Structure formats: structure tokens, C-alpha cells
Curated annotation (Swiss-Prot), chain A:
Membrane topology: Single-pass type I membrane protein
Annotated protein name in UniProt: Spike glycoprotein E2
Protein localization: Virion membrane; Host cell membrane
Entire protein: shown range: 640 to 744 of 1242
The organism's place on the tree of life at top rank: Viruses
Record note on modification: Palmitoylated via thioester bonds. These palmitoylations may induce disruption of the C-terminus transmembrane. This would result in the reorientation of E2 C-terminus from lumenal to cytoplasmic side. N-glycosylated.
From Swiss-Prot, chain B:
Localization: Virion membrane; Host cell membrane
Disulfide cross-links: C49-C114, C62-C94, C63-C96, C68-C78, C260-C272, C302-C377, C307-C381, C329-C371
PTM: N-glycosylated.
Shown chain mapped onto the complete sequence: 802 to 1242 of 1242
Segments of this protein annotated with the region E1 fusion peptide loop: 84-101
Topology feature Extracellular, residues: 1-417
Cytoplasmic domain ranges by topology: 439-441
Role summary: Class II viral fusion protein. Fusion activity is inactive as long as E1 is bound to E2 in mature virion. After virus attachment to target cell and endocytosis, acidification of the endosome would induce dissociation of E1/E2 heterodimer and concomitant trimerization of the E1 subunits. This E1 trimer is fusion active, and promotes release of viral nucleocapsid in cytoplasm after endosome and viral membrane fusion. Efficient fusion requires the presence of cholesterol and sphingolipid in the target membrane.
Entry membrane topology: Single-pass type I membrane protein
Glycosylation sites: N134
Protein name, as recorded: Spike glycoprotein E1
Subunit structure: The precursor of protein E3/E2 and E1 form a heterodimer shortly after synthesis. Processing of the precursor of protein E3/E2 into E2 and E3 results in a heterodimer of the spike glycoproteins E2 and E1. Spike at virion surface are constituted of three E2-E1 heterodimers. After target cell attachment and endocytosis, E1 change conformation to form homotrimers. Interacts with 6K protein.
Length: 105, 441, 49
């Protein structure tokens, strides 16, 4: 019988009913490596840690592609007024720091 | 002094509070519930039991014919058989051959056991809720008397005056119609005293166990006596009440939620746990001492020795204090993080004392007040070794009770870094836009 | 009886009277009966006066 924190009462034959409650022992360890914190909350909350892990891997995935959509849009605007004219002198700050493509010619 | 608060609807867990009258020392207050009975109002509709079909003596005419009259009896039956030629002891009973008549009437009446076991049909309505409360305050011992759970009627216990507030929910385990057979209660529907399908539950309904009028359908039907034997046979369907005692499910005292044990004599529903109960109490003015006649503590330092997750009293901590004089003053933690086992401490001049507490958090961040002076407490707790215990939890589990310090750090890392990685992306497009405007002119 | 289940035998015929189409009642939740008349009054509920 699955006993949760609310409790469970069972009767057997002509014996009086007995109530038992479940504690929060678990198996995992919360203060440790990332392969142990996930295990500990998988036993204590099996219904929530598979949604929150899927939510946090979806917020990160959406935020990763939106940022590189804006970063590469910044990147080709560094080059498009400078690679159209090869005689224009590229400053040494814009070669590596502000945008990736280094100077030439 | 009037002190109003809200207590939960838990039986075994006491409610501890600290009243604060200005100019006076605080007084400890402990309220505990001992019962919780919900008593609905019932009116009995009818009873039912097993029948008993009695047969009177039939008349035997030697050669003739009679027809019976319709008698005011439940399920009365008549059927006249012609030409029986019956035999008894000492030769044939009658002389006129091939033309005889047997009456053979029958009807249905109640049985002798209907005064012992019978199912009673009830309709319930919302009634009164009554509870018993254990009360102590200050140096006065525990005093107990029953109360009424409604926000109007007061109860005088000891020298105080308590008004228990109305329940926050109107949940009741009873259906609109119930059947009370013997010891246990069932949720069932009635055929409403005018119908009955002769074999299920309402084949014999009487409004009162001592009533005169009775309704019964049992498909009673007489048969023809054979071979010249003076007897009246009949066939009918068996008892529905006898059939009901086999094919009945689980009673209401084994099905009902929230652990409501069901008693019978007023048909209450004892010891449910749903909602919360507001309180209002009147502590007498003789239980308040002046503020100048009490110790005033200072230099409080709290260190938690051992803490654990277990449900019952899991935590020991030490508090170092410095008091002006020796005396007694209570302790209380007003937050919901931890509850306190003790109620008061005996003080000295610059000593120490210990208290016991129970909590559900990994890192307790609660504070306690002793001698109208507060002190915070922090520490770490371990999971308990035991798996199943036979007592309810003293504490309340919150939403952030299970989140540790390491798990909080991964939340801030996985939110702050991804938010700044868009903010840097958003501020990157605000740099070349200003640069492009400078390049235009 | 005014309910759609219980039959009544009037002589030989059998009449079933259906339920009323309106659930209207003139009484309140709390009434006071003095003498031979009723009043739709509220109560102190045995604790106040």
C-alpha cells in the first residue's frame, strides 16, 4: 500500500484500525554534485522535477537562439560598411574586440 | 483582554500563542481540540425488515361454492379451487364427489425479528457543529468543557470566555439520503415508500416499528393443492432485505475522506480535518502582571546543536542569555517555520537554557522571543532514518521547505546568466545602431 | 403525496400526482411561533441577549 504524508488507515479482521504516516527520508543527497541533487528531488517530488527540468531546458534553449539571432545581426553590421570598401582603414579595436573578423589588406 | 486569532482544524496539534497587553508582561496561551463532531438533523422516513407470510385455516365445503371478500390486508390473496376431494386422517373428509371448494387465503405481515435488526431510512439536513477545547493560560492548569462551533455562542471555561468561530467549509460526508443498519451507516437512495421491486430493498416498508399500516409487495401467489391433501402452498420471490445484507458494499465509516470516524447515537461524524477555525478568547485581567516586576534579558545568542526532518520534536538548540534578575517568562516562535516543545523557562543570572523544536525546513530561519526580547536562529538539518511513523506531523510543510542552499544557487545561476545573455544581446543592437547614425553624418 | 413516485388508490383507480413545478415556500430559515401565528424573525442563537 502506498502511504503518503497525509496518512493511511488499515483494518485487518476484528482488530481495531491502525494509522501510519510516511516521513520524508528519501535516498538522495541535497548538498553535493549535480548528479545527486537531481536524484534527491526525483524521489521527494517525482511529479514536479521532470517538468521543471523540461521547463528550464526550454527557457535556456529559447534564450540561446534569440541571443545569437541578435549577436550575429550585430556581427554582420560591423563588416558591411567595411568589406564593401577595401581601401577603408579598419580600426584595431573593431578587428577583434567589438566584432570577430580581423583587419586585412 | 480580547485576543482573536485563527486556529487550524487539527485535533491532536495544540495552538500556542502569546498575548501582548501594553504595560504588562505577555501571557502564554495554549488551545487544544479534543473532539470535533458534525451533527446533522435527521427525520426518519420508514424501516424495513424480513417479512413473514402467515396462512389462516382454509374452509372446506363438502359440495358448494363460496367467494371471499377483499380484505384490508397488505398483499392479500384469494383463489378458489374447485373439486379437490381432500383426505385427512380417518378416511375421506367429504362425501360429495368431484365438486368441492378450498378457500386458501394468505397475506404478508411483519416478522418477530423486526424489533432487533432493521434498516432505517433517513433524510439529513445541516445542523449543529460541536467541539471540545482544552484551555490553559499562565500558571492556571488545563480546564475543559464542550463548545458550540458558531461565532455567536460563548462558553465560560475557568474564568475565561471563548467564542469558537464557524467552520470555513461546509463539507459533510453524508449524502442527502442515508441508511442506518445496525452499527454502520450507508449512502443509499430510497424508493420513497410507494414503490418496491419485490427483491432489492423496499419490498416491505413500514413508517414506524410499532405502526399498524404496512406496505408490502412480494409477488405472493397461491398454488393448487394436489392429490387430496389439506394444505395451502404458495410461491413468492425471496426477501430483498435478506438479499441486501449480502450484496451491500462498504459502509460510510470505511469510505469517508479526511479520516472521519462515524458514531451513531446522534448520528455524528466525529474528528474530521478540513478548513480552519477562527478563535476569540477573553483572558481575565487578574492573569496579567505588571511589566516592571519581570526579568529583562539581554545579550541573547542562539546556536542550533542538532536538527532533523522528523515529524516529531526534531531539534535541539542552546541559547546563552544575561538577565537582570531570576524569574520565569515564556518562549514563543511566531513564524510558521518551527514550533516549540516547551512553554516557559526558569531564568538565572547569566546562565544558559535549552529548548526543543520541530521543523520541516533544511535551513530554519525562525526567531523566538523570550522576556519580550527576540533572538534569531539558523542552522542545518539532516533527513531522518525512519521510513514510517505512527504519529502525525507537528509542523506544516511550506513550498520552499525542501529547497537547500545548493539548489538555490543553481536557480540563480540558471536564471541570472540567461537573463544577462539576452540583456547583453539587446544592448549589442543598441551600440551599432548608434554607430550607424554616426556613420550617416 | 405530491411526488412522482408514490401511487394512491382512490376507490379502484390509481392516481400518481407529479412533483410541483415551483420550489417556493413562504417560510424563512428561522421562524418564531407565538400563539397561533408565525413570524419570520431572526435569532440571538442562544448565546447573546
Amino acid at each position: 500500500f502506498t502511504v503518503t504524508g497525509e496518512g493511511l488507515e488499515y483494518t485487518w479482521g476484528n482488530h481495531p484500525p491502525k494509522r501510519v504516516w510516511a516521513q520524508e527520508s528519501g535516498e538522495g543527497n541535497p548538498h553535493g554534485w549535480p548528479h545527486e541533487v537531481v536524484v534527491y528531488y526525483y524521489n521527494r517530488y517525482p511529479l514536479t522535477t521532470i517538468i521543471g527540468l523540461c521547463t528550464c531546458v526550454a527557457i535556456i534553449m529559447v534564450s540561446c537562439v534569440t541571443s545569437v539571432w541578435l549577436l550575429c545581426r550585430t556581427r554582420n553590421l560591423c563588416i558591411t560598411p567595411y568589406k564593401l570598401a577595401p581601401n577603408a582603414q579598419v580600426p584595431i579595436l573593431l578587428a577583434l574586440l567589438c566584432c570577430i573578423k580581423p583587419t586585412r589588406a | 483582554y480580547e485576543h482573536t486569532a485563527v486556529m487550524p482544524n487539527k485535533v491532536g496539534i495544540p495552538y500556542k500563542a502569546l498575548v501582548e497587553r501594553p504595560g504588562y508582561a505577555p501571557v502564554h496561551l495554549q488551545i487544544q481540540l479534543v473532539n470535533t463532531r458534525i451533527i446533522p438533523s435527521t427525520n426518519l422516513e420508514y424501516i424495513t425488515c424480513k417479512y413473514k407470510t402467515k396462512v389462516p385455516s382454509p374452509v372446506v365445503k363438502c359440495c358448494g361454492a363460496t367467494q371471499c371478500t377483499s380484505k384490508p390486508h397488505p398483499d392479500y390473496q384469494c383463489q378458489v379451487f374447485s373439486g379437490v376431494y381432500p383426505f385427512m386422517w380417518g378416511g375421506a373428509y367429504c362425501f360429495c364427489d368431484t365438486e368441492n371448494t378450498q378457500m386458501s387465503e394468505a397475506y404478508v405481515e411483519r416478522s418477530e425479528e423486526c424489533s432487533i435488526d432493521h434498516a432505517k431510512a433517513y433524510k439529513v439536513h445541516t445542523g449543529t457543529v460541536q467541539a471540545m477545547v482544552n484551555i490553559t493560560y499562565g500558571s492556571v492548569s488545563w480546564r475543559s468543557a464542550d463548545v458550540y462551533v458558531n461565532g455567536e455562542t460563548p462558553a465560560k471555561i475557568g474564568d475565561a470566555k471563548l467564542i469558537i468561530g464557524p467552520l470555513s467549509s461546509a463539507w459533510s460526508p453524508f449524502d442527502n439520503k442515508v441508511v442506518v443498519y445496525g452499527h454502520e451507516v450507508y449512502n443509499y437512495d430510497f424508493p420513497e415508500y410507494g414503490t418496491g421491486k419485490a427483491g432489492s430493498f423496499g419490498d416491505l416498508q413500514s413508517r414506524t416499528s410499532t405502526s399498524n399500516d404496512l406496505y408490502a409487495n412480494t409477488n405472493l401467489k397461491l398454488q393448487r393443492p394436489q392429490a387430496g391433501i389439506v394444505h395451502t402452498p404458495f410461491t413468492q420471490v425471496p426477501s430483498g432485505f435478506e438479499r441486501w445484507k449480502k450484496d451491500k458494499g462498504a459502509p460510510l465509516n470505511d469510505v469517508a475522506p479526511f479520516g472521519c470516524s462515524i458514531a451513531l447515537e446522534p448520528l455524528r461524524a466525529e474528528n474530521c480535518a478540513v478548513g480552519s477555525i477562527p478563535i476569540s478568547i477573553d483572558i481575565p485581567d487578574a492573569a496579567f502582571t505588571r511589566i516592571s516586576e519581570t526579568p529583562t534579558v539581554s545579550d541573547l545568542e542562539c546556536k542550533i546543536t542538532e536538527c532533523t526532518y522528523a515529524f516529531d520534536f526534531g531539534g535541539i538548540a542552546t541559547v546563552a542569555y544575561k538577565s537582570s534578575k531570576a524569574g520565569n517568562c515564556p518562549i514563543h516562535s511566531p513564524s510558521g517555520v518551527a514550533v516549540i516543545k516547551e512553554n516557559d523557562v526558569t531564568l538565572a543570572e547569566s546562565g544558559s537554557f535549552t529548548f526543543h523544536f520541530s521543523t520541516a525546513n533544511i535551513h530554519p530561519a525562525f526567531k523566538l522571543q523570550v522576556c519580550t526580547s527576540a533572538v534569531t536562529c539558523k542552522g542545518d538539518c539532516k533527513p531522518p532514518k525512519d521510513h514510517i511513523v505512527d504519529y502525525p506531523a507537528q509542523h506544516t510543510e511550506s513550498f520552499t521547505s525542501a529547497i537547500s542552499a545548493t539548489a538555490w544557487s543553481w536557480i540563480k545561476v540558471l536564471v541570472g546568466g540567461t537573463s544577462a545573455f539576452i540583456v547583453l544581446g539587446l544592448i549589442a543592437t543598441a551600440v551599432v545602431a548608434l554607430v550607424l547614425f554616426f556613420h550617416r553624418h
